[PDB]
């Protein structure tokens, strides 16, 4: 029997900052309490120290910040936390679902310096929920403005190198694609091309996000089948989420605005209820993005 549960997916590039703001706006702003929360960060800590010895007080800081921000109408249990340098993913479920979560595994893949360090890359948590297999990936891909090939390479390398082991020590490992349900979120860093920074801002003024999409690097590459084969993205009905002046909604361009921050998915029995950014949070040069899904899970 398929029963629907509500999944919240969120991605936020916090530009090396500690949380200054209440996250309720992002994580529980006029939504029903999700059954499951998948919350992704990039650039959690930008220090060389963090890049070097992993430890950083930004982890407890954003964890406290997310937990305080979850929907107040339910109690949530943290299932798993995973981080590679500045890339962190948190998985929470309502306390009443905890017993039905199993085979939780978490892995990381660095795809930055030398094609292997964690300045860029991916982290993932997969698990079983009742009798449905789910994998959630948070990734931070190459930032070069022109050279999207580097993002495609990061994406190809997360897919080929991310391997989850299994209790049975005689079985092959699982890859990201070996799941009934895949959610992929992150600062994917694809930008807008050809169009002038003037036109790109003006298009954003009059809210004509359809025309702009035709020049979005991610749209183009997905159609070219160089990444995200089989994935869907909901219509982008919110303005690009990068790059803003910290503490405001004005632009900064050291580089047109861009839909850096995205959530895609593939699987049967997945319906997307919403796809938003959250302008009111001004702690970072990105805005956070969120999506709620009704996902059908097989319950036996
Ligand atoms: Ca790379
Ligand atoms: Mg930054």
Curated annotation (Swiss-Prot):
Binding site for Mg(2+): 15, 43
Binding site for substrate: 43, 119-120, 242-243
Renumbered residue ranges of the record's region 5-phosphatase: 2-300
Tissue-level expression: Platelets.
Compartment(s) where it occurs, according to its Swiss-Prot or TrEMBL record: Cytoplasm, Cytosol; Endoplasmic reticulum-Golgi intermediate compartment; Early endosome membrane; Membrane
Domain of life of the source: Eukaryota
Subunit structure: Interacts with APPL1, PHETA1 and PHETA2. Interacts with several Rab GTPases, at least RAB1A, RAB2A, RAB5A, RAB6A, RAB8A, RAB9A and RAB33B; these interactions may play a dual role in targeting INPP5B to the specific membranes and stimulating its phosphatase activity. Interacts preferentially with non-phosphorylated RAB8A; phosphorylation of RAB8A on 'Thr-72' disrupts this interaction. Interacts with INPP5F.
Function: Hydrolyzes phosphatidylinositol 4,5-bisphosphate (PtIns(4,5)P2) and the signaling molecule phosphatidylinositol 1,4,5-trisphosphate (PtIns(1,4,5)P3), and thereby modulates cellular signaling events.
Family: Belongs to the inositol 1,4,5-trisphosphate 5-phosphatase type II family.
Domain remark from Swiss-Prot or TrEMBL: The ASH (ASPM-SPD2-Hydin) and RhoGAP (Rho GTPase activating) domains form a single folding module. The ASH domain has an immunoglobulin-like fold, the Rho-GAP domain lacks the catalytic arginine and is catalytically inactive. The ASH-RhoGAP module regulates the majority of the protein-protein interactions currently described. The ASH domain mediates association with membrane-targeting Rab GTPases.
Descriptive protein name: Type II inositol 1,4,5-trisphosphate 5-phosphatase
Provenance organism: Homo sapiens
Lineage: Eukaryota, Metazoa, Chordata, Craniata, Vertebrata
Underlying gene: INPP5B
Residues of the full protein shown: 342 to 643 of 993
């Amino acid at each position: 029997m398929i029963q629907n549960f509500r999944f919240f997916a969120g991605t936020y590039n916090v530009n090396g900052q500690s949380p200054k703001e209440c996250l309720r706006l992002w994580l529980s702003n006029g939504i029903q309490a999700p059954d499951v929360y998948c919350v992704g960060f990039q650039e959690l800590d930008l220090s060389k120290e963090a890049f070097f010895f992993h430890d950083t007080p930004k982890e407890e800081e954003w964890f406290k910040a997310v937990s305080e921000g979850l929907h107040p109408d339910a109690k949530y249990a943290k299932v798993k936390l995973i981080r590679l340098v500045g890339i962190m993913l948190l998985l929470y479920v309502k306390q009443e679902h905890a017993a039905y979560i199993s085979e939780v595994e978490a892995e990381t893949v660095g795809t930055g310096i030398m094609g292997r360090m964690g300045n860029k890359g991916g982290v993932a948590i997969r698990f079983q929920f009742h009798n449905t297999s789910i994998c959630v990936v948070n990734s931070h891909l190459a930032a070069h403005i022109e050279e999207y090939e580097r993002r495609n390479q990061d994406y190809k390398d997360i897919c080929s190198r991310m391997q989850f082991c299994q209790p049975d020590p005689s079985l092959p490992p699982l890859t990201i694609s070996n799941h009934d349900v895949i959610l992929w979120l992150g600062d994917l860093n694809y930008r807008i091309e050809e169009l002038d920074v003037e036109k790109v801002k003006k298009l954003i003024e009059e809210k004509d996000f359809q025309m702009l999409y035709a020049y979005d690097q991610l749209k183009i590459q997905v159609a070219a089948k160089t990444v995200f084969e089989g994935f869907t993205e909901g219509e982008l009905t919110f303005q690009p989420t990068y790059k803003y002046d910290t503490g405001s909604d004005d632009w900064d361009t050291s580089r047109a605005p861009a839909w850096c921050d995205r959530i895609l998915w593939k699987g049967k029995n997945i319906t997307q209820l919403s796809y938003q950014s959250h302008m009111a949070l001004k702690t970072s040069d990105h805005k956070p993005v969120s999506s709620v899904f009704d996902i059908g899970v097989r319950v036996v």
